[PDB]
Amino acid sequence: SLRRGIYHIENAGVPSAIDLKDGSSSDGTPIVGWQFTPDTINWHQLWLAEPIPNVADTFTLCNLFSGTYMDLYNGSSEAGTAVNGWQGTAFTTNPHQLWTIKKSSDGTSYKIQNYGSKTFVDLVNGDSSDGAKIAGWTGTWDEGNPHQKWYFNRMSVSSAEAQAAIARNPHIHGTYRGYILDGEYLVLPNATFTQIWKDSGLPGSKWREQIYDCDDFAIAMKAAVGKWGADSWKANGFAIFCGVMLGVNKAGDAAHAYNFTLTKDHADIVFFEPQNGGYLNDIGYDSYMAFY
Amino acid sequence: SLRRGIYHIENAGVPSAIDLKDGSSSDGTPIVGWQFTPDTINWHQLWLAEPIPNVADTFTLCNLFSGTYMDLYNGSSEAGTAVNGWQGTAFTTNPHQLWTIKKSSDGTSYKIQNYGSKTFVDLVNGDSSDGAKIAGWTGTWDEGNPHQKWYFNRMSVSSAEAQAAIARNPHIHGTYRGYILDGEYLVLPNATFTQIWKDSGLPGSKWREQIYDCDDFAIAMKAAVGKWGADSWKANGFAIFCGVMLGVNKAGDAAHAYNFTLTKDHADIVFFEPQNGGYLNDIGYDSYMAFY
Ligand SMILES: C[C@@H]1O[C@@H](O[C@@H]2[C@@H](O[C@H]3O[C@H](CO)[C@H](O)[C@H](O)[C@H]3O)[C@@H](O)[C@@H](CO)O[C@@H]2O)[C@@H](O)[C@H](O)[C@@H]1O
Ligand SMILES: C[C@@H]1O[C@@H](O[C@@H]2[C@@H](O[C@H]3O[C@H](CO)[C@H](O)[C@H](O)[C@H]3O)[C@@H](O)[C@@H](CO)O[C@@H]2O)[C@@H](O)[C@H](O)[C@@H]1O
Ligand SMILES: C[C@@H]1O[C@@H](O[C@@H]2[C@@H](O[C@H]3O[C@H](CO)[C@H](O)[C@H](O)[C@H]3O)[C@@H](O)[C@@H](CO)O[C@@H]2O)[C@@H](O)[C@H](O)[C@@H]1O
Ligand SMILES: C[C@@H]1O[C@@H](O[C@@H]2[C@@H](O[C@H]3O[C@H](CO)[C@H](O)[C@H](O)[C@H]3O)[C@@H](O)[C@@H](CO)O[C@@H]2O)[C@@H](O)[C@H](O)[C@@H]1O
Ligand SMILES: C[C@@H]1O[C@@H](O[C@@H]2[C@@H](O[C@H]3O[C@H](CO)[C@H](O)[C@H](O)[C@H]3O)[C@@H](O)[C@@H](CO)O[C@H]2O)[C@@H](O)[C@H](O)[C@@H]1O
Ligand SMILES: C[C@@H]1O[C@@H](O[C@@H]2[C@@H](O[C@H]3O[C@H](CO)[C@H](O)[C@H](O)[C@H]3O)[C@@H](O)[C@@H](CO)O[C@H]2O)[C@@H](O)[C@H](O)[C@@H]1O
Ligand SMILES: [Ca+2]
Ligand SMILES: [Ca+2]
Ligand SMILES: [Ca+2]
Ligand SMILES: [Ca+2]
Ligand code: NA
Ligand code: NA
């Protein structure tokens, strides 16, 4: 089953992502194949999958940037029918915007079937061109046709996945308590995490006893990622992953505040020092408190 | 004994505070009597008292605004000697900048005696004028002379005072844990707290599911007070009081994030809702976690 999340949806046949052209919020904005760069924010190519309760394996697909929904034009079962961005809502009954997503015959890629037409999201002719038409097209759940097969490359973690990542870390103090703020988190590439840090002005901040010390840097960095989240994305129903941790050294005589993020595989945490922008597998403190 | 803290130092005879003229960081900036407004930030009139270890009841007095020290000019024991702002350090051995502060004969006001000259901070002639000379002057620990008597009006709380304030509150959840970030906190009048909130742009922010919801507003408000702290004050060795709390309703089925501050008497907390700028004795949640 596809879990609730943010996915980069990549064609199984050619290296083309599902892309809402120019990220435009206009109704009828064409959704097309476009090339992508790994370990970046592919700004027009992220999709919030929202499960519809009481309809098995069916979702809305919301462009994280535009806040508009993958829409099969007039819900036509005709092959070649336009797939566009269109205004809607996460739990809409509009079947132009409802998508049954289940594993392809290869067991790793998915097919995307319009709930109303029962036709499939097709990268027309397997065209690897930037701006290649994606359409609703006749097909079957079992065939190998790669025009209609899509890797759902997962870009978010549930809170529960975040917890699992922290609990797998060997620098957690015996007294650790974690405070969970949200349910679903876009995981940032370090390159993006670092850019948000630079854009916060924190690289310019100086350490000052109590008035601007490690707790002030850690919380400024979490607030800056929360600000960036609301200012960058028009979709709702997710947060941006950026943790705060208070830690203690081995001697038990020094406390420090810092940030953490997750690895590309989402399986482990990495510590971030907001006073120099370093990433570390070991920051020299054992976390006794985190919030994220 | 005077505790480590930030004090508004007010003459016992007339309503004049010790004021570093124009808050100037220039060496030899005159320190004078000036009128004040209660329940405001008196920007040039706050003094960080730092106890010197191994010298009983003796302190540096650092202007919170200027980051410069109360300085008896050339340490002269002559009556009429200038008291100025001067560059120095919190644990200086320069006795021009060391002050023995102990209760006056009335048991409530203090006398301020230069550790080197043994002469007293005197509001010359009890002059209530704005800009009235303050000087080192001959005197005795026991006399009633109000020119030389000073109420130390305490503006900070220790972390321990903050804890006592929270523990006195009746909206603390059974599972509550408090995470202490600093040691000494300037307590803001609501009028100032509110201004920092308005100046953060938070009144303009909209509630968005997970992407900018109550946790995002609470942490943006704490970061904005930390920013205001470093940008407003040149002294070090204190923080600005602004709490974050996560709470749960009576039903146990809803969690909310909010801020809190302290009362003017420092004895109790007040909840702040950063989504509407309201202050409340009861926000409808019992705090299970705070950091401050
Ligand atoms: C059958 C038809 O469904 C709705 O119209 C859809 C479009 O729906 C969506 O956009 C419209 C505004 O253009 C509206 O906001 C609606 O709530 C939203 O779901 C859309 O799917 C287009 C393109 O495929 O096709 C239909 O026109 C509805 O608005 C109509 O009244 C009517 O019931
Ligand atoms: C290369 C080509 O692959 C298959 O055709 C696809 C199309 O496939 C889909 O539509 C056809 C009807 O045109 C049929 O219903 C099939 O079951 C279904 O997967 C479609 O992907 C289009 C648009 O991109 O491209 C190809 O024409 C196959 O049917 C052809 O014989 C041939 O092997
Ligand atoms: C006896 C004298 O003490 C020091 O001088 C003080 C002044 O001291 C302070 O400012 C100077 C720079 O002007 C310097 O930064 C020093 O570290 C700091 O404590 C000051 O108290 C003035 C006014 O009362 O009087 C003396 O000039 C020291 O610098 C001198 O070398 C000398 O030891
Ligand atoms: C009104 C006045 O009060 C007292 O005099 C103060 C001064 O008092 C202090 O200095 C005098 C020496 O001039 C003396 O040493 C005294 O013990 C000490 O408190 C002083 O505060 C000045 C500057 O403001 O103003 C007054 O002159 C008292 O001695 C006077 O007789 C008279 O009652
Ligand atoms: C916001 C904008 O993002 C990039 O341009 C997008 C583009 O993005 C993808 O394609 C480019 C090459 O054209 C790279 O592979 C990126 O890794 C992809 O994310 C597409 O989304 C198209 C179609 O919507 O629109 C462009 O705006 C970037 O090149 C721009 O500089 C800018 O950052
Ligand atoms: C920063 C500056 O603060 C105020 O002016 C100060 C002034 O402050 C005190 O006196 C005024 C009346 O003159 C009020 O009672 C205030 O409550 C006091 O804090 C003094 O500190 C003098 C001497 O240093 O300098 C002025 O700058 C305020 O009036 C200004 O508008 C401004 O906010
Ligand atoms: Ca939340
Ligand atoms: Ca701090
Ligand atoms: Ca601290
Ligand atoms: Ca949130
Ligand atoms: Na469902
Ligand atoms: Na001492």
Residue numbers in the entry:
A (entry chain AAA), B (entry chain AAA): 2 to 293
Excerpt from the publication:
The Marasmius oreades agglutinin (MOA) is the holotype of an emerging family of fungal chimerolectins and an active Ca2+/Mn2+-dependent protease, which exhibits a unique papain-like fold with special active site features. While acting as a dimerization domain, the papain-like domain of MOA retains the characteristic L-/R-domain partition of PLCPs. As additional feature, the MOA dimer carries two binuclear metal-binding clusters, symmetrically placed at the dimerization interface (Grahn et al., 2009). MOA requires the presence of calcium or manganese (II) to switch from the inactive form to an active protease (Cordara et al., 2011, Wohlschlager et al., 2011).
While other divalent cations cannot functionally replace calcium or manganese, cadmium or zinc inhibit the enzymatic activity of MOA (Cordara et al., 2011). Zinc and cadmium strongly inhibit the proteolytic activity of MOA and papain (Cordara et al., 2011, Shukor et al., 2006). It has been suggested that zinc binds at the catalytic center of PLCPs, directly coordinating the cysteine and histidine side chains of the catalytic dyad. To provide a structural basis for the inhibition, we collected anomalous diffraction data on MOA crystals grown in the presence of either zinc or cadmium. The anomalous difference maps of cadmium-containing crystals (calculated from data collected at 6.0 keV) show a similar feature, consistent with the previously suggested inhibition mechanism. Furthermore, zinc and cadmium inhibit the activity of MOA by forming a tight complex with the catalytic cysteine (Cys215) and histidine (His257), as predicted for papain. Finally, we showed in this work that complex formation of the catalytic dyad with metal ions like zinc or cadmium inactivates the enzyme.
